[PDB]
Design a protein around this ligand. Structure first.
Ligand SMILES: */C=C\C(=O)NCc1ccc(-n2nc3c(=O)[nH]nc(N)c3c2-c2oc3ccc(C)cc3c2C)cc1
Length: 275
């Protein structure tokens, strides 16, 4: 085994990204059972120097296989290529030389967007402008990722993170999901930018149900039949009909008649200008 046998693991130095280990202070886990895997940390100088910011850090669990090493390197490498955008979880640096493998990313203090919304459900805080703002920002992030030839494949609210100032940041771009899959991905395993638009529709619905679970009481086995037979989710009560309209256009059976992310950005931007 690579990890079993090596005293030192000779990953190549990439100076664009290598980050000095003495500038990084590991903190508490950044999940439930995520000790030894994903943690909070403080990182100094990124630079506006001698100054600290909070970041997130992934590492290999003490029982990691060669496969886990590969997955983490792959993910690190994908994040190198994509570039920087305000509405994605950006790579900040890597520690690969002279010690354990660390992948360092932006930390969004408020967690994922499903739980952000669910926690703040009324019996306002989650007003229509707030919801539209979440929708708009996710759309901009996707427009960016699509421009970098990146198909997400698992765009869902659990995979959007919320910063201290309520900025949306898409995560898991560098890697039950069935309910978020376009028919052509379910049936034919084809993923396109337009299958991510479908996924976005579902995410919109998540937003407007304040973190609701899609297709309530429908077993994932029948979802395939139902969607082929033209089943679609209904309008959330927190949703004006004009928005439900967008949602439904995202779930058009024909990929070419779904809007693009550019159009979703522009439509949503107008709804903000209206308020
Ligand atoms: C420990 C098991 C496990 O890996 N669970 C999945 C998982 C999903 C997300 C995060 N995580 N939560 C975050 C948060 O609330 N705020 N900001 C960030 N960045 C958060 C993450 C997260 O941390 C890292 C570190 C490194 C990479 C490459 C990616 C991510 C993400 C998405 C933790 C665990």
């Amino acid at each position: 085994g690579l990890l079993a046998g090596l005293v030192s693991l000779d990953l190549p130095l990439d100076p664009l990204w290598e980050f000095p280990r003495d500038r990084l202070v590991l903190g508490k886990p950044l999940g439930e059972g995520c000790f030894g895997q994903v943690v909070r940390a403080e990182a100094f100088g990124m630079a506006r120097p001698d100054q600290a910011s909070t970041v997130a850090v992934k590492m290999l669990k003490d029982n990691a296989s060669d496969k886990d090493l590969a997955d983490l390197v792959s993910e690190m490498e994908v994040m190198k290529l994509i570039g920087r955008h305000k509405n994605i979880i950006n790579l900040l640096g890597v520690c690969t030389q002279e010690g354990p493998l660390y992948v360092i990313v932006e930390c969004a203090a408020k967690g994922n967007l499903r739980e952000f919304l669910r926690a703040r459900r009324p019996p306002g805080p989650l007003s229509f402008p707030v919801l539209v703002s979440c929708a708009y920002q996710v759309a901009r992030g996707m427009q960016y990722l699509e421009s970098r030839k990146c198909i997400h494949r698992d765009l869902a609210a659990r995979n959007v993170l919320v910063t201290e100032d309520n900025v949306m940041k898409i995560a898991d771009f560098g890697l039950l999901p069935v309910k978020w899959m376009a028919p052509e991905a379910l049936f034919d395993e084809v993923y396109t930018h337009q299958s991510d638009v479908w996924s976005f529709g579902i995410l919109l619905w998540e937003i407007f149900t304040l973190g609701g679970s899609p297709y309530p009481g429908i077993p994932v086995e029948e979802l395939f039949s139902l969607l082929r037979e033209g089943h679609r989710m209904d309008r959330p009560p927190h949703c004006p009909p004009e928005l439900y309209g967008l949602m439904r256009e995202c779930w058009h059976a024909a990929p070419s008649q779904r809007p693009t992310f550019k159009q979703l950005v522009e439509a949503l931007d107008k709804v903000l200008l209206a308020v």
